[PDB]
Design an enzyme around this catalytic site. Structure first.
Site, PDB file in Angstrom:
ATOM      1  N   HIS A  62       8.581 -39.300  28.191  1.00 54.71           N
ATOM      2  CA  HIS A  62       7.908 -40.432  28.842  1.00 54.71           C
ATOM      3  C   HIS A  62       7.533 -40.158  30.288  1.00 54.71           C
ATOM      4  CE1 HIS A  62       8.690 -42.856  25.333  1.00 54.71           C
ATOM      5  NE2 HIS A  62       9.990 -42.638  25.456  1.00 54.71           N
TER       6      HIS A  62
ATOM      7  N   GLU B 292      11.564 -43.803  31.753  1.00 54.27           N
ATOM      8  CA  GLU B 292      10.840 -44.732  30.880  1.00 54.27           C
ATOM      9  C   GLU B 292      11.069 -46.152  31.407  1.00 54.27           C
ATOM     10  OE1 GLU B 292      12.280 -44.948  26.887  1.00 54.27           O
ATOM     11  OE2 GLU B 292      10.542 -46.055  26.128  1.00 54.27           O
TER      12      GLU B 292
END
Ligand SMILES: OC[C@H]1O[C@@H](n2cnc3c2N=CNC[C@H]3O)C[C@@H]1O
Ligand SMILES: OC[C@H]1O[C@@H](n2cnc3c2N=CNC[C@H]3O)C[C@@H]1O
Ligand SMILES: *[C@@H]1O[C@H](CO)[C@@H](O)[C@H](O)[C@H]1NC(C)=O
Ligand SMILES: *[C@@H]1O[C@H](CO)[C@@H](O)[C@H](O)[C@H]1NC(C)=O
Ligand SMILES: *[C@@H]1O[C@H](CO)[C@@H](O)[C@H](O)[C@H]1NC(C)=O
Ligand SMILES: *[C@@H]1O[C@H](CO)[C@@H](O)[C@H](O)[C@H]1NC(C)=O
Ligand SMILES: *[C@@H]1O[C@H](CO)[C@@H](O)[C@H](O)[C@H]1NC(C)=O
Ligand SMILES: *[C@@H]1O[C@H](CO)[C@@H](O)[C@H](O)[C@H]1NC(C)=O
Ligand SMILES: *[C@@H]1O[C@H](CO)[C@@H](O)[C@H](O)[C@H]1NC(C)=O
Ligand SMILES: *[C@@H]1O[C@H](CO)[C@@H](O)[C@H](O)[C@H]1NC(C)=O
Ligand SMILES: [Zn+2]
Ligand SMILES: [Zn+2]
Lengths: 497, 497
Positions: free
Chosen positions: B364, B339
């Site tokens: 993510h 992320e």
């Protein structure tokens, strides 16, 4: 148990990470001992700036707007190393945007018969008129000599001229905070200079300044987009495109004869993609003729100007296919700007498909390319280099944080890439050093060092349009420049042990 | 190669068709009713894109959610996605997945709730059944008293909401950097921590998660939870197994009430700021809960800001501990990983360790497109990437959502599920806002109902249901989908093609 010990785990982990390092741009380069010493210093510097941003929780300046990052990068060792480094070639440039605005002010607007006016949008425009003030069509033209002499402050007058023309006077990301707002300003810049920069002796000298400035940034070769058309004399005579090409040919020849350390230049004819297909058809036929009669100086054809709202390659497809349909066929080379867009699945990014079906030699920008896996295959298989212009793509509204630049995943896949600057004069960039710095700091990783720089530099000659003899000579010259740069750098940064 | 336009068109469509077949959902064959709905969706999608492109105005689906939320909700595509069954939301945090309005209108109307203004001028909320809390850093006041004395209860309740939500102002403007907005995001959790850990409020908040997700036509959720430390009015603090049991009882009663709802499973989360010795204990805890609550307790995840905190490698002996036992234990992992905008750093290399540790899904994976070998491993192993597009924009990874790094993942058919992450924190719906921005920004103009259907099916097929549960859930989903198709044709007047 797969990983009973730390050694089993790190062995697997290092092989996986190392396998990606071998796959990225420059991953097959083996640095010699002197190169390794410079590489170790570069990597220490790169880790220091990244780890400070990450662990001290502050913005990564190499990735912010060029308006903010320019002054900051220029004081750093990595920038100073890239500045001294031979760049090889700048393959994506426009001929009215690749020399200093300062020269337009200090040289061109000090010539006789130069006029200025403020247009209805409150921007200065410049032109030449050998027959008194031009007709006051929505602009009150005034002689620049008179305006300067009566300004009461000549240096402030000249600075104001520069400030009114440059896109880096304010941060474009703030002042023009949308794609179409910044493209309005960009279009306006060319309208501001169009009159003065198409006056033949000014245009000749501006092109020479491109060559001088690029050589001064340790660039040895350029390929330049040019409209070629409409250069005009004091008496009003308008020259045809062939004349414009011959003018550039003579400037280039004199320059290379003066500077044997410079490889030269070649020209791509450009046409704005707002014109009707009948105009593009005429320009394609023009390009066919110039390609036949000026081989090795005239390279082929490109369509320029804003890609999203204007005509697609498919909109011109009958003209673009015309050379291949001749009997016998003529292979007019194409260097299409293509995919300079955030759109996906539209007429705009699908220009990438047509650029490859039309056998483009290189593709300009290719920002949408990472969204097109089958086009990537063709680009890699055919060796069609993507001309990556990172400062241009940020300032002209494709991305904000340059670590989101869509060419980073291309470089991780070893898609053929060359870095270029596009319109460095417009926003006060250097010929190549600023763009090479942002590519190095934003478009590859913390552990990517001198090998990435070396590969990008070699790529710019390898994917140039030089012939076999030219390219062999240029690569020998580049190698000599590179060796001198390594040796000089070890002394300069006190890395010899 | 292209003597006529027919041959050129055929090669063009072959290439474009190849990419459409390759991307997410490209192999789906729509039935005739679905095709009618698809045709309307595509007509709507082209109309908004063409207006932005040709009328040179910003593409609202891609701007800050603060700006786009109220604009998208009036459009047919959004309304279709709102009615659409979503399948599952697989990436959620249990203190961030119900409405702040419920915290205000319900939780802060309960007895013994206190408020104070902290040193950063944010309201904090807590419960104390044993007198007012000690005035350590702020002065606690009974909310009941403050509300009754406000003279405008509606404004007081609206002030509470405004002081807690991240969508009160545009976070891209108010907190214009990664670490400023993470400061605000961290602050949000501190504002609610006291009140939302009070056991009866925590129980009822979790029930509200299920009610709201069911109301947005989501039939199943997997939720990250810390599980531990829920406290009673008398000061009793409960352990993690109690917390898990509390959620299990709520879920069982919810499914009893609503047989049209598949249910929920729980992932233990721990913040990645703790020493490795503490993470070891949380791994041991997770092994025990996984053994004794199979089919409700799923495994383990490390959360909180990824860039400045501890990497997976920094915990590697803790995370390898289950696999190293005799006999080995396979504790499933759901790591938040990659992320980040960083490349070649310890942060994005968390993706390497997530794969080496056999992660079931990756949270993510923003950096994944920079990692070609990790991509191939994710594809070959079927490790779904949980893509949270509103979260990634608001929390500082990207500005224009068309630059979202999952768009090139979807174009290669990397397995992806859409989720909302923390929808209550910034006033999003359970799934419909994120599914709309995914549909409008992360795939192309020519991507229609087949993409939506594939993403919805993906959320069940890559859930952690066992094979029998998946079959049951897909039967329910199919019935919901058929009802949605029929209802949509009537609603949008499409029945006669
Ligand atoms: O006179 C120069 C012409 O080239 C265009 N041009 C100049 N730089 C670029 C252009 N066009 C497209 N993409 C962005 C950038 O790469 C502007 C004008 O029409
Ligand atoms: O109490 C909830 C915990 O979860 C974290 N958390 C909540 N949402 C996210 C978190 N962590 C990382 N990435 C962004 C997003 O996906 C915050 C806090 O530590
Ligand atoms: C963080 O900044 C401080 C100075 O403010 C400096 O001492 C320290 O080295 C920095 N940390 C990193 C990792 O750069
Ligand atoms: C402008 O450039 C020309 C051509 O190089 C040069 O002859 C002339 O003197 C210059 N003008 C000034 C003011 O330096
Ligand atoms: C250009 O100059 C005018 C007149 O001084 C000024 O008002 C205007 O702001 C300037 N524009 C830019 C973009 O600098
Ligand atoms: C493109 O190049 C290929 C390979 O040389 C050639 O066969 C084909 O005719 C070319 N097509 C066009 C449209 O120029
Ligand atoms: C642009 O806007 C006008 C109205 O302002 C509208 O009629 C026209 O259709 C729009 N163009 C597109 C392509 O949507
Ligand atoms: C809050 O929720 C609880 C439990 O669902 C319910 O009993 C109570 O009526 C609610 N309070 C308000 C003010 O609506
Ligand atoms: C929270 O409330 C205080 C007190 O009214 C106010 O001054 C402050 O601006 C608010 N903060 C936010 C982030 O809304
Ligand atoms: C990962 O899974 C594979 C296949 O099930 C197994 O053989 C291996 O031991 C696992 N590795 C770890 C580190 O748990
Ligand atoms: Zn260009
Ligand atoms: Zn999360």
């Amino acid at each position: 148990v797969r990983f009973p010990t730390m050694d089993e785990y790190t062995n697997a982990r290092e092989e996986l990470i190392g396998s990606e390092q071998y796959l990225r741009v420059g991953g097959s380069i083996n640095l010699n001992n002197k190169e390794k010493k410079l590489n170790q210093f570069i990597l220490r510097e790169k880790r220091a700036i990244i780890e400070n941003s990450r662990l001290n929780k502050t913005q990564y300046i190499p990735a912010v707007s060029f308006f903010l990052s320019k002054s900051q990068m220029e004081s750093t060792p990595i920038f100073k190393i890239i500045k001294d480094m031979p760049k090889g070639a700048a393959l994506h440039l426009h001929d009215t945007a690749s020399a200093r605005i300062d020269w337009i002010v200090s040289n061109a607007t000090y010539r006789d018969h130069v006029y200025m006016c403020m247009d209805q949008d409150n921007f200065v425009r410049l032109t030449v008129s050998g027959t008194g003030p031009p007709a006051n069509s929505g602009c009150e033209w005034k002689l620049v000599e008179t305006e300067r002499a009566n300004s009461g402050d000549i240096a402030a007058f000249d600075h104001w001229l520069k400030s009114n023309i440059s896109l880096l006077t304010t941060d474009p990301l703030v002042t023009y905070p949308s794609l179409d707002k910044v493209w309005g300003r960009f279009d306006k810049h060319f309208s501001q200079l169009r009159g003065i920069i198409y006056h033949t002796p000014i245009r000749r000298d501006y092109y020479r300044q491109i060559l001088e400035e690029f050589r001064s940034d340790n660039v040895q070769y350029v390929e330049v987009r040019s409209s070629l058309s409409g250069y005009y004399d004091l008496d009003g005579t308008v020259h045809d495109p062939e004349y414009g090409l011959q003018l550039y040919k003579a400037v280039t020849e004199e320059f290379v004869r003066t500077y044997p350390d410079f490889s030269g230049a070649k020209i791509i004819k450009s046409t704005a993609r707002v014109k009707p297909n009948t105009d593009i058809f005429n320009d394609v036929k023009l390009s066919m003729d110039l390609y036949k009669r000026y081989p090795g100086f005239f390279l082929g054809f490109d369509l320029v100007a804003q890609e999203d709202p204007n005509t697609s390659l498919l909109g011109y497809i009958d003209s673009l296919l015309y050379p291949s349909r001749q009997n016998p066929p003529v292979s007019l080379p194409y260097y299409f700007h293509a995919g300079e867009t955030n759109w996906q699945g539209t007429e705009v990014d699908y220009n990438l498909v047509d650029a490859l079906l039309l056998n483009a030699t290189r593709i300009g920008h290719g920002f949408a390319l990472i969204k097109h896996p089958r086009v990537i295959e063709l680009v890699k298989s055919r060796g069609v280099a993507v001309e990556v212009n990172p400062v241009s793509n940020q300032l002209l509204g494709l991305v904000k944080d340059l670590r989101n630049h869509a060419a980073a995943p291309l470089l991780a896949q070893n898609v053929p890439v060359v870095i270029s600057s596009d319109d460095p004069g417009v926003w006060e960039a250097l010929p190549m050093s600023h763009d090479m710095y942002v590519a190095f700091m934003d478009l590859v990783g913390e552990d990517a060092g001198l090998d990435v720089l070396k590969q990008l530099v070699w790529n710019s000659i390898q994917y140039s349009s030089m012939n076999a003899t030219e390219k062999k000579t240029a690569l020998k010259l580049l190698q000599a420049k590179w060796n001198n740069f390594i040796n000089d750098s070890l002394i300069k940064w006190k890395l010899t042990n």
